Amino acid sequence: TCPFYKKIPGTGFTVDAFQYGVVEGCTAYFLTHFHSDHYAGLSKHFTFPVYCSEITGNLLKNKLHVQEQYIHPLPLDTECIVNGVKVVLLDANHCPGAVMILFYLPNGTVILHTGDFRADPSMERSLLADQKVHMLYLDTTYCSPEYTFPSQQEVIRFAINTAFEAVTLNPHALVVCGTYSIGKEKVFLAIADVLGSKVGMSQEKYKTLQCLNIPEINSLITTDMCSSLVHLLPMMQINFKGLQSHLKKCGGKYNQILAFRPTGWTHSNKFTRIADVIPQTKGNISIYGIPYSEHSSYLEMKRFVQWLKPQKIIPTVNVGTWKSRSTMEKYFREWKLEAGY
Numbered sequence: 001t002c003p004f005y006k007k008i009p010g011t012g013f014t015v016d017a018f019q020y021g022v023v024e025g026c027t028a029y030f031l032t033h034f035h036s037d038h039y040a041g042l043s044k045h046f047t048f049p050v051y052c053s054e055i056t057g058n059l060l061k062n063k064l065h066v067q068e069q070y071i072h073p074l075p076l077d078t079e080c081i082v083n084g085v086k087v088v089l090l091d092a093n094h095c096p097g098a099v100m101i102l103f104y105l106p107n108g109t110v111i112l113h114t115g116d117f118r119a120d121p122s123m124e125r126s127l128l129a130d131q132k133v134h135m136l137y138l139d140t141t142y143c144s145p146e147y148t149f150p151s152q153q154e155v156i157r158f159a160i161n162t163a164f165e166a167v168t169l170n171p172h173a174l175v176v177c178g179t180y181s182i183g184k185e186k187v188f189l190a191i192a193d194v195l196g197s198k199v200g201m202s203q204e205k206y207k208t209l210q211c212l213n214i215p216e217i218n219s220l221i222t223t224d225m226c227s228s229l230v231h232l233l234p235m236m237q238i239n240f241k242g243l244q245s246h247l248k249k250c251g252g253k254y255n256q257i258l259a260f261r262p263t264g265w266t267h268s269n270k271f272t273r274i275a276d277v278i279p280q281t282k283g284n285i286s287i288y289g290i291p292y293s294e295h296s297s298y299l300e301m302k303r304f305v306q307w308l309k310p311q312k313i314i315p316t317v318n319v320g321t322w323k324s325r326s327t328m329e330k331y332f333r334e335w336k337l338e339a340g341y
């Protein structure tokens with residue numbers, strides 16, 4: 001059964017609620033983004049209207065085989081009427097195709113559902129500038145001050161400068177990048193661009209990337225692994241054993257691997273600056289964990305919410321423990337007392 005924080009009151013709508021069977025009263029199911037915890041339950045046998053971005057709809061059609069007649073893509077930044085209710089989709093600064101949803105309820109209440117997001121000051125000049133929000137359904141993934149990490153731009157600068165130095169020193173080094181979902185594509189694209197290479201990958205991953213509307217993508221990626229010196233592998237294979245096994249398959253073209261594991265936050269962010277990050281090394285293999293986040297830091301979250309000044313906040317992440325819920329409620333009250341709303 002569908003929990004309360006996935007229902008939009010005063011509507012027939014749900015958000016990210018496909019794992020509960022037929023939800024009573026639901027006339028339109030919104031999907032914020034194509035990550036498995038959020039699409040859990042969708043398949044080719046789904047027969048209710050799904051509302052989403054264009055990119056999410058391409059993934060639903062080609063990867064999950066949802067039939068076309070049930071996929072309803074909406075443009076961004078555009079007032080649309082769905083089942084009698086005005087909605088707008090906004091870019092969430094998460095993975096490709098990820099949106100926030102503004103719902104203008106028939107009684108005058110305005111609700112923002114962030115989906116998953118990485119808050120940014122650019123959002124203060126979207127269609128949110130124009131009006132009041134009564135209820136915020138908030139991605140609280142990193143809602144605690146210990147969760148710190150660098151800008152995506154600093155992380156990419158580190159990755160490009162590390163990969164270019166290593167391969168210039170040794171032209172026979174291979175670079176490998178891990179992946180297990182969409183998102184974080186700039187990691188492997190930026191490294192392959194500085195190296196003058198296409199990115200090589202499985203047919204399954206190529207198919208996924210071909211759904212993302214990335215400009216000039218045919219110029220950037222390939223399934224011909226032999227032609228490429230930046231390879232994508234499943235995240236599970238990014239370890240000394242899996243990398244060794246991969247290097248064997250490359251027919252003596254290479255004599256070294258440099259690998260990247262994009263993570264979210266890890267406790268080494270408590271101690272180590274991005275500049276000072278070092279790899280784990282075994283023989284001719286080195287593995288870097290890089291803190292590339294597609295969720296708000298504590299400070300980015302707090303800025304967003306203090307600017308928006310919502311009347312009520314409903315967390316959508318970390319909702320399962322009393323300790324998490326009490327921690328988040330304390331920070332919401334601090335923020336409100338500090339800013340005066």
Ligand code: NI
Pocket residue numbers: 033035094116
């Ligand atoms: Ni997500």
